[model samples]
Target: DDFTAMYKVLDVVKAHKDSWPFLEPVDESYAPNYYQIIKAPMDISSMEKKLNGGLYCTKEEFVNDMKTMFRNCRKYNGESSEYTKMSDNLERCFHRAMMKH
Candidate 1:
């Protein structure tokens, strides 16, 4: 059940159009300061990769990753940053969809 919930979470977020910037990790090649501010940076692909990777030990723990995942967006971007805004929206989507499962 936990395993399934985790995948569902990934897909739902992936489905969101605003999730674009979060789909991949940023490197010095594009935004050099990205790493400077967001230390434990995470992207959807890496999320997917890790989700596949041992399933974060379980969805309970996966939720922790989710917290980390969206938190980076807010801090890196700042107040109401379009990216941060999506975090709030996507988090809602995650739970609303999460309930059905």
Candidate 2:
């Protein structure tokens, strides 16, 4: 039942997709696929290639880029959804993924 809230949140996320660059940018410069998310090894190299070599040009940079987005959202309570709780969820996943280091 808790996930019900997130589904509502996701609907809001989808609705704002056009305006939000990271959600689904019209430029199509970057778009995350379901497969890219589920793939094993979560291949950093492959993701880096897709991102056209993120800013500083390192797998860590790419990873941090994504991490930074979620982290920053903790304070981004603009429209719908509780951003701080969302940050808590991100922290749980990051911790489990061995990303604490």
Candidate 3:
């Protein structure tokens, strides 16, 4: 079942390849925060393992990640419609991925 779920995640990743670049940086950056909040002694990859271990994540963490993403995007893009569109696309892709998980 783990392998099947991993394949599902991979399928979602492949389906949304274009949106990955827009979202990944912020997601990667948030890994450290996740470590701190979860009090994990290891790196982001390790924390990701926990999520994939059971397709589990709390609403608060997910919300914080989204907020962080928006702030980072605004910091870099600054009222640009382009980033807004990209973020919207990211949300669509992200929702698909979450549903798969």
Candidates' TM-scores? Answer: 0.85, 0.35, 0.42
Candidate 3: C-alpha RMSD after superposition? 7.4
Tens digit of per-residue lDDT, candidate 1, span 3-100: 77788878988898777777787666766588878878777898788878775876677777778888887887787677788888888887787787
Give the count of colliding residue pairs in each prediction. Answer: 0, 0, 0
What CA RMSD would you report for each candidate?
A: 1.7, 13.8, 7.4
Cα RMSD, model 2: 13.8
lDDT of 2 by residue, 1-101 (tens): 32333223333433432313334312222333423433222222333344543334444554564465554443333335464455455445544443322
What's model 3's TM-score? 0.42
Per-residue lDDT tens digits for candidate 3, residues 1-101, read 54455446545543564545442323437334533343223222332454567544454453344445545554554666576666666556656766767
Clash-forming residue pairs, model 3: none
Candidates 1 and 3, the one with greater lDDT: 1
| Pairs of residues at least 3 apart in sequence or in different chains that clash in candidate 1 | none
Alpha carbon lDDT at 36, candidate 1: 77
Say which candidate scores most in lDDT: 1
